[PDB]
Amino acid sequence: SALFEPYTLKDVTLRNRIAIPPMCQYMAEDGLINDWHQVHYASMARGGAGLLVVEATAVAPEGRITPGCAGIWSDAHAQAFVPVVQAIKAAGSVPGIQIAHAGRKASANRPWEGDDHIGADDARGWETIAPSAIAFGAHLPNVPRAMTLDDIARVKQDFVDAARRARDAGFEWIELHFAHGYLGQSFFSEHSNKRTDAYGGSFDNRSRFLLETLAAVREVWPENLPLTARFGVLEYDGRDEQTLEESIELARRFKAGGLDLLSVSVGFTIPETNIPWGPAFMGPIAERVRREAKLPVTSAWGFGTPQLAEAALQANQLDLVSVGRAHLADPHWAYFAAKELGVEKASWTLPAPYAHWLE
Amino acid sequence: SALFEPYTLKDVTLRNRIAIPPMCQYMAEDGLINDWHQVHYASMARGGAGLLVVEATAVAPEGRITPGCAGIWSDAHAQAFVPVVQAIKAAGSVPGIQIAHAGRKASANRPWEGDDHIGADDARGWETIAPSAIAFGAHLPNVPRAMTLDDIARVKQDFVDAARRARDAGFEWIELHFAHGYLGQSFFSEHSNKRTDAYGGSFDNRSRFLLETLAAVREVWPENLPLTARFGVLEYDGRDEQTLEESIELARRFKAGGLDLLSVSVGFTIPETNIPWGPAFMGPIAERVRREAKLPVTSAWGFGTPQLAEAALQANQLDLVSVGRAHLADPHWAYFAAKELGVEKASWTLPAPYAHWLE
Ligand SMILES: Cc1cc2c(cc1C)N(C[C@H](O)[C@H](O)[C@H](O)COP(=O)(O)O)c1[nH]c(=O)[nH]c(=O)c1N2
Numbered sequence: 091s092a093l094f095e096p097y098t099l100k101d102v103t104l105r106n107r108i109a110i111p112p113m114c115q116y117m118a119e120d121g122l123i124n125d126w127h128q129v130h131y132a133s134m135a136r137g138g139a140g141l142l143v144v145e146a147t148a149v150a151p152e153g154r155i156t157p158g159c160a161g162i163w164s165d166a167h168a169q170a171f172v173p174v175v176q177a178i179k180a181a182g183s184v185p186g187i188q189i190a191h192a193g194r195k196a197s198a199n200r201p202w203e204g205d206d207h208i209g210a211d212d213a214r215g216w217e218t219i220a221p222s223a224i225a226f227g228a229h230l231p232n233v234p235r236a237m238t239l240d241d242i243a244r245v246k247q248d249f250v251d252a253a254r255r256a257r258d259a260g261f262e263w264i265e266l267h268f269a270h271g272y273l274g275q276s277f278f279s280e281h282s283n284k285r286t287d288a289y290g291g292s293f294d295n296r297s298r299f300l301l302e303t304l305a306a307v308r309e310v311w312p313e314n315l316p317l318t319a320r321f322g323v324l325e326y327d328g329r330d331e332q333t334l335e336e337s338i339e340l341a342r343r344f345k346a347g348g349l350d351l352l353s354v355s356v357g358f359t360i361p362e363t364n365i366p367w368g369p370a371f372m373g374p375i376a377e378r379v380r381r382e383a384k385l386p387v388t389s390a391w392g393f394g395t396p397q398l399a400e401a402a403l404q405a406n407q408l409d410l411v412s413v414g415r416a417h418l419a420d421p422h423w424a425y426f427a428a429k430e431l432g433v434e435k436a437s438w439t440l441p442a443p444y445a446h447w448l449e
Numbered sequence: 450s451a452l453f454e455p456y457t458l459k460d461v462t463l464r465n466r467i468a469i470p471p472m473c474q475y476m477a478e479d480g481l482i483n484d485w486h487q488v489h490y491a492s493m494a495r496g497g498a499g500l501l502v503v504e505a506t507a508v509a510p511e512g513r514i515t516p517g518c519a520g521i522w523s524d525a526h527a528q529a530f531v532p533v534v535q536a537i538k539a540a541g542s543v544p545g546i547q548i549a550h551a552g553r554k555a556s557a558n559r560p561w562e563g564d565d566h567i568g569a570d571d572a573r574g575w576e577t578i579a580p581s582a583i584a585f586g587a588h589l590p591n592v593p594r595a596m597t598l599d600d601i602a603r604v605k606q607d608f609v610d611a612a613r614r615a616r617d618a619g620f621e622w623i624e625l626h627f628a629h630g631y632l633g634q635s636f637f638s639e640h641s642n643k644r645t646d647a648y649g650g651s652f653d654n655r656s657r658f659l660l661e662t663l664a665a666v667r668e669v670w671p672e673n674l675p676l677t678a679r680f681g682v683l684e685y686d687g688r689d690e691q692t693l694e695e696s697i698e699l700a701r702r703f704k705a706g707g708l709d710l711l712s713v714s715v716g717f718t719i720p721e722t723n724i725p726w727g728p729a730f731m732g733p734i735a736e737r738v739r740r741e742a743k744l745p746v747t748s749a750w751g752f753g754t755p756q757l758a759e760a761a762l763q764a765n766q767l768d769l770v771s772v773g774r775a776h777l778a779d780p781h782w783a784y785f786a787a788k789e790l791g792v793e794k795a796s797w798t799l800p801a802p803y804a805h806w807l808e
């Protein structure tokens with residue numbers, strides 16, 4: 091089975107091609123993770139996935155999506171991740187982390203608590219920052235503060251500091267969050283970036299924040315550990331042909347800047363879109379990025395069917411398959427997949443105290 | 450649906466009728482549980498089961514099955530369970546524990562490490578104790594030493610000490626392990642008990658160790674928390690009619706002695722048997738014990754299909770359905786069952802960070 095072949099990137103070897111993508115838990119307090127996360131991540135890692143990327147973790151407090159988001163903006167925050175890292179490794183999985191800044195989509199309620207921008211009366215809220223003073227709209231009407239050159243320099247340095255802290259916590263895989271309409275994606279998109287300085291206007295200028303951040307992080311992140319990023323390569327906003335061409339060119343520049351793998355996603359930069367949600371709908375998009383930018387890729391958004399995952403690998407659309415919600419439903423989904431694809435000794439996808447009894 | 454009705458017994462209310470029965474993990478060292486257990490139990494509790502009975506926990510070192518079995522024979526051992534109790538409660542489940550003594554089946558290898566008696570030259574082994582100096586046979590050939598009267602007093606007191614510790618660690622449900630061929634079962638069975646003192650021969654005498662242990666535990670275990678036991682009510686040894694009749698009379702005496710619920714199982718006292726394994730095969734046996742002894746019951750051994758569980762409850766065969774291996778496969782099996790049975794807002798069997806997304 092393609093899905094259960096190992097994968098080696100730099101010095102890291104994954105035991106199979108199942109990745110658990112970052113999934114916000116909204117259970118942290120002041121950025122600090124706790125027993126919610128400890129058990130959540132340890133249980134999924136024991137489930138058999140080869141790679142577990144920890145949820146979007148804010149590089150600065152204002153970079154959280156919500157008051158429940160994890161952070162890594164101080165050494166105390168980083169120390170809190172050490173037992174999560176070590177529990178993932180003890181299970182035989184590889185620990186990764188996604189470091190993030192929510193940009194204009196920050197200062198929002200938890201999804202099951204309204205999922206909308208926090209109101210001004212509410213004392214949980216904070217001022218948001220973005221390339222331009224323009225609101226997402228819809229359920230996120232708050233207008234961000236337009237970043238100055240000093241802000242841009244400060245945020246870049248926050249990504250660098252976060253990467254250094256991830257390294258020292260023991261993460262073996264890092265993912266820069268340049269997707270889903272948050273700070274990085276919003277610098278790239280003409281929808282949200284109306285700057286007239288070096289960071290807006292042209293393709294080179296709009297790309298600049300992303301490329302400068304990647305290069306700054308590259309200076310502290312170990313050369314022998316995968317350096318990856320997540321990027322929304324189209325919006326389904328009526329501009330897909332040109333947007334995707336630009337996105338793929340940026341992926342070529344990521345590669346020339348030392349990126350080891352790209353997690354291919356959707357932009358979500360504005361609400362006025364028509365995303366054609368469906369089983370494995372990103373497969374052919376990821377394939378095009380992979381082939382044209384000549385870079386390893388993963389993608390998500392409809393692969394929790396073991397046959398869909400296997401198919402995407404056999405078609406060389408993906409190098410890793412990211413399976414999210416199915417792991418929330420069943421933290422041992424990788425075992426389920428091994429059974430469903432007829433892997434020999436499928437139960438030994440799991441640790442002995444389970445595997446012995448399930449074969 | 451019947452599966453998702455609450456259950457109240459003494460001061461304890463279970464949020465549904467799904468119980469996770471005790472399942473040995475063989476991952477402890479010198480009886481001390483560790484991070485294996487912490488995550489294992491916390492993840493299953495978050496999966497939605499109403500009751501989680503912690504694995505067979507030895508009241509004394511020689512009463513472990515294996516060198517990996519959990520123990521509660523010191524206050525340090527009991528303190529190790531406190532975070533497990535706390536995590537089970539935090540998940541909305543009720544924490545229980547099974548306290549145990551393996552009798553002549555003790556001093557064995559872990560199941561994936563041969564599953565047989567440790568040989569005499571292996572320094573990991575120990576002398577075993579039992580009512581009479583008779584081996585189980587087959588893969589457990591070691592002959593136990595016959596217990597003295599002082600041994601019997603000491604082991605009863607170890608059960609008392611274990612219950613006291615379990616109480617103080619915060620467990621809300623206790624289960625005495627009088628099943629599966631271990632020490633208690635072996636006092637009751639004529640196959641293993643050939644004693645000629647007060648603890649063997651007659652039905653009263655064979656019952657004595659079990660009834661005295663129950664009464665001694667009852668003195669320390671709070672009256673407002675369920676006091677339960679697991680007991681093998683037949684062997685499938687060609688003596689089932691008489692064995693079942695005696696087992697049911699013993700169950701009546703347990704009830705008279707303050708037992709709140711009986712977990713109905715198979716004796717496994719000797720290897721020379723013909724157990725008719727199949728889906729829910731214990732259902733009719735449990736029903737008969739329930740009806741004739743007038744005690745609430747649970748059972749296991751083939752109920753991990755949601756329809757089989759639901760059917761057993763509607764037929765009033767069981768008050769709680771114990772689902773073991775399906776929870777090793779999927780710690781969130783209770784959510785899977787809620788979906789399979791068409792429970793409304795089934796995803797909210799799980800905590801919010803999962804339920805919101807799975808709706
Ligand atoms: C609870 C939850 C939380 C998040 C997500 C989604 C969900 C369900 N996703 C998107 C996620 O990584 C993935 O791409 C999607 O879930 C699609 O994959 P599945 O169809 O769920 O396998 C996500 N994406 C990301 O880049 N960083 C993150 O922290 C989050 N957080």
Ligand SMILES: Cc1cc2c(cc1C)N(C[C@H](O)[C@H](O)[C@H](O)COP(=O)(O)O)c1[nH]c(=O)[nH]c(=O)c1N2
Pocket residue numbers: 443447470471472473474504505547626628629679749750751752753771772773774775
């Ligand atoms: C790994 C493992 C370990 C144990 C068990 C079984 C398994 C699979 N079982 C028996 C268990 O509680 C249950 O009765 C059986 O698993 C049958 O139920 P299922 O068919 O698995 O739902 C068990 N029984 C018991 O009384 N105390 C225990 O500690 C153990 N340990």
Ligand SMILES: CCCCN1C=C(C(N)=O)CCC1
Pocket residue numbers: 114146155269270358
């Ligand atoms: C962005 C649209 C839906 C996917 N989600 C992504 C998140 C992320 N942190 O990238 C958080 C919630 C949902």
Ligand SMILES: CCCCN1C=C(C(N)=O)CCC1
Pocket residue numbers: 473505514628629630717
């Ligand atoms: C006689 C074996 C029945 C199932 N098991 C029960 C155990 C028990 N501790 O009661 C341990 C292993 C297996």
Ligand SMILES: [Ca+2]
Pocket residue numbers: 576577591592593594
């Ligand atoms: Ca011996």
